[PDB]
């Protein structure tokens, strides 16, 4: 095995190294893109050990109180 092409289901570690020496533009492109999903799936670790999420922004119009109109309201009349 002086320079043989590694077999992917027999030598997974050596198969990665072949495409890390001879095709640098392919190996390190995927690795940078791999951190995207990897960090996304690590969010549930952050929700408990670093800080909790912010409250959702009030982007639904004027917040309408969940009640009925107050009849007794007076003042600022005509």
């Amino acid at each position: 095995a002086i320079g043989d092409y590694p077999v992917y289901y027999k030598q997974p570690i050596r198969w990665l190294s072949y495409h890390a020496h001879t095709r640098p533009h392919v190996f390190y492109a995927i690795a940078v893109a791999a951190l995207g999903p990897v960090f996304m799936m690590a969010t549930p670790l952050r929700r408990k050990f670093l800080y909790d999420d912010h409250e959702p922004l009030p982007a639904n119009g004027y917040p309408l109180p969940n009640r009925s109109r107050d009849k007794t309201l007076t003042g600022y009349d005509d």
């Binding site: 320079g3 020496h21 640098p24």
Partner: protein, 55 residues
Amino acid sequence: EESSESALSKATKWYLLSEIFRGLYITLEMYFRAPYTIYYPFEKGPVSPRFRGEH
């Protein structure tokens, strides 16, 4: 499999343009050196007593 510099070492030189940036710096060295230019006709280049010119 017989390369001294590891895959990461070769990739960093390759991706970060190590030799080009060195090539740029050496050019920038010459920017802070005195140019060879002389100002004709206010100055002339050297001549030798054996110079062959106008008959």
